[PDB]
Amino acid sequence: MEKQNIAVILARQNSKGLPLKNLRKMNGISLLGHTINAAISSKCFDRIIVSTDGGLIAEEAKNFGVEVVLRPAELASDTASSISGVIHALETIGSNSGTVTLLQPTSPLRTGAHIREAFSLFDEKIKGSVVSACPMEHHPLKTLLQINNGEYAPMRHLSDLEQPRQQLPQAFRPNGAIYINDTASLIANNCFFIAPTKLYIMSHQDSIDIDTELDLQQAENILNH
Amino acid sequence: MEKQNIAVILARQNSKGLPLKNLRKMNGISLLGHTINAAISSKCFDRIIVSTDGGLIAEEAKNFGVEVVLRPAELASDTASSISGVIHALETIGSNSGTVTLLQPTSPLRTGAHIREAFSLFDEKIKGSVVSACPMEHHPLKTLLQINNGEYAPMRHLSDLEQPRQQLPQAFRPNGAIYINDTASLIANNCFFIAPTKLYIMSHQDSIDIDTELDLQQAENILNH
Numbered sequence: 001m002e003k004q005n006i007a008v009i010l011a012r013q014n015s016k017g018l019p020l021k022n023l024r025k026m027n028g029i030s031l032l033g034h035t036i037n038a039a040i041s042s043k044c045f046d047r048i049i050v051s052t053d054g055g056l057i058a059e060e061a062k063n064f065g066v067e068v069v070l071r072p073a074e075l076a077s078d079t080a081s082s083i084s085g086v087i088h089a090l091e092t093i094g095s096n097s098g099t100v101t102l103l104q105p106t107s108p109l110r111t112g113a114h115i116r117e118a119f120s121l122f123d124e125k126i127k128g129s130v131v132s133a134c135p136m137e138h139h140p141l142k143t144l145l146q147i148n149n150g151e152y153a154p155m156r157h158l159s160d161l162e163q164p165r166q167q168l169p170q171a172f173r174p175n176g177a178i179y180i181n182d183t184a185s186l187i188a189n190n191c192f193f194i195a196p197t198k199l200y201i202m203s204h205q206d207s208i209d210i211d212t213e214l215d216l217q218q219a220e221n222i223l224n225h
Numbered sequence: 226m227e228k229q230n231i232a233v234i235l236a237r238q239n240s241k242g243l244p245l246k247n248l249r250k251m252n253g254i255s256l257l258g259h260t261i262n263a264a265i266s267s268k269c270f271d272r273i274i275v276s277t278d279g280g281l282i283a284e285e286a287k288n289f290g291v292e293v294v295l296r297p298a299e300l301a302s303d304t305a306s307s308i309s310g311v312i313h314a315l316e317t318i319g320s321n322s323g324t325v326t327l328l329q330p331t332s333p334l335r336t337g338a339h340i341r342e343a344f345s346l347f348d349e350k351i352k353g354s355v356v357s358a359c360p361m362e363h364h365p366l367k368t369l370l371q372i373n374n375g376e377y378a379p380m381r382h383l384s385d386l387e388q389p390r391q392q393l394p395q396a397f398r399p400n401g402a403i404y405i406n407d408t409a410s411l412i413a414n415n416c417f418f419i420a421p422t423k424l425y426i427m428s429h430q431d432s433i434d435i436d437t438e439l440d441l442q443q444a445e446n447i448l449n450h
């Protein structure tokens with residue numbers, strides 16, 4: 001079968017952090033709508049699929065002119081991985097060759113231009129992932145993790161907690177906005193991070209993601225500049 | 226010798242991100258001044274020492290009515306650990322018994338009330354650290370580190386990158402604001418994290434730290450409410 005560049009936007013309906021998160025408006029347009037417009041305007045995709053369990057989400061997808069894949073509940077639950085949804089979408093439309101890009105609606109400031117730029121890093125021959133990421137304001141080695149009840153362990157070393165920032169390995173946060181992969185490689189590896197992975201750097205600002213009403217407010221302030 | 230509760234504020238002059246960072250004003254008062262007022266108003270300390278390599282910083286300390294220790298350049302360079310400075314300050318004033326608290330000027334929204342609350346977690350008998358910390362907006366396991374080669378490795382597992390947030394261990398960032406220790410234990414362990422460590426939780430908002438002009442702007446917005 002022929003190579004196709006698919007955009008898959010996973011957008012479950014019953015979001016727990018904030019009700020109907022993927023439909024929440026930000027400057028008059030839904031989170032879903034922002035990512036769809038970004039996919040459309042990027043002009044990188046032969047097909048744009050929104051995958052959802054919910055008719056409210058499906059209905060919004062249709063009004064933006066894009067295809068919809070209906071997910072069974074097990075693939076939309078709070079424990080479901082993104083990979084299982086994207087694979088399910090690929091199986092439904094019958095694509096296993098070309099490129100598949102995950103575009104999460106939680107990243108409203110990611111634009112068509114970002115998608116274009118990310119694509120120019122993707123290499124048809126080598127077929128490693130392109131993943132959008134931003135540098136971090138606070139180094140993740142300088143953290144404690146809960147191990148039992150009332151015990152906290154350092155991420156790696158106790159000494160790392162007190163290391164001058166610059167002595168530590170450079171750290172990047174994948175921001176959720178863009179994950180580009182060779183489709184067959186995605187299917188084979190069953191993950192979004194495939195060697196050799198290139199990072200597409202976005203500003204911490206443009207990497208804002210929505211968990212809360214505040215995040216939404218703040219993204220709106222950012223957009224208006 | 227008698228037990229004394231020392232506050233040590235390490236405040237180097239030649240800050241290499243943001244020029245003269247520790248003297249930067251935020252609502253009319255320097256970062257240094259904010260942490261000094263917090264120490265003074267907490268009423269937890271017998272002595273308050275500002276340790277610096279620089280006369281501008283020393284001068285500001287004197288105007289707030291607190292003691293100054295002059296650090297030799299080697300203890301104020303970008304590679305110097307905070308511990309070496311605090312120990313040096315303890316040796317200078319001749320305290321090795323009681324409690325020593327590190328208060329970093331980069332945490333302007335940490336107040337005397339925070340210090341007081343942190344102190345009520347400290348146990349004279351058990352003598353483990355109290356360290357101020359806040360929960361994280363983004364999980365540090367979901368990160369990549371530069372390994373020397375050109376290539377990015379996951380913090381822990383590749384699978385962690387795609388895990389739903391809630392499946393991951395709870396994460397806390399020590400925020401730099403408060404580190405309380407038994408003085409002799411600090412000296413013995415030569416670090417700020419001494420078992421059994423208690424965490425003093427602050428909001429992410431109150432845990433804001435200053436690396437940039439924006440951080441300073443943002444702290445100013447926060448304070449005015």
Ligand SMILES: Nc1ccn([C@@H]2O[C@H](COP(=O)(O)O)[C@@H](O)[C@H]2O)c(=O)n1
Binds near residue numbers: 022081105
């Ligand atoms: N299994 C999953 C996981 C995430 N998602 C969606 O992808 C985005 C990422 O959400 P998280 O940051 O919760 O993974 C959200 O828009 C969320 O609704 C989904 O639709 N199905």
Ligand SMILES: Nc1ccn([C@@H]2O[C@H](COP(=O)(O)O)[C@@H](O)[C@H]2O)c(=O)n1
Binds near residue numbers: 329
């Ligand atoms: N050796 C050191 C390390 C940090 N500092 C100060 O401690 C605070 C913490 O800075 P970092 O977060 O960069 O270590 C800053 O105010 C910095 O100027 C210092 O005065 N001497």
Ligand SMILES: CC(=O)N[C@H]1[C@H]([C@H](O)[C@H](O)CO)OC(C(=O)O)=C[C@@H]1O
Binds near residue numbers: 163306307401417434
């Ligand atoms: C007590 C301590 O940890 N001091 C360290 C401090 C701290 O880790 C950070 O301020 C946490 O926010 O930061 C840095 C740094 O250059 O980044 C150097 C200090 O040696």
Ligand SMILES: CC(=O)N[C@H]1[C@H]([C@H](O)[C@H](O)CO)OC(C(=O)O)=C[C@@H]1O
Binds near residue numbers: 082175
């Ligand atoms: C591709 C991927 O990793 N998707 C995951 C996503 C991501 O890690 C984060 O949104 C990046 O910022 O988050 C979560 C989550 O419940 O938090 C689950 C998704 O399966």
Ligand SMILES: [Cl-]
Binds near residue numbers: 012016
């Ligand atoms: Cl969600």
Ligand SMILES: [Cl-]
Binds near residue numbers: 239240246247
């Ligand atoms: Cl500094």
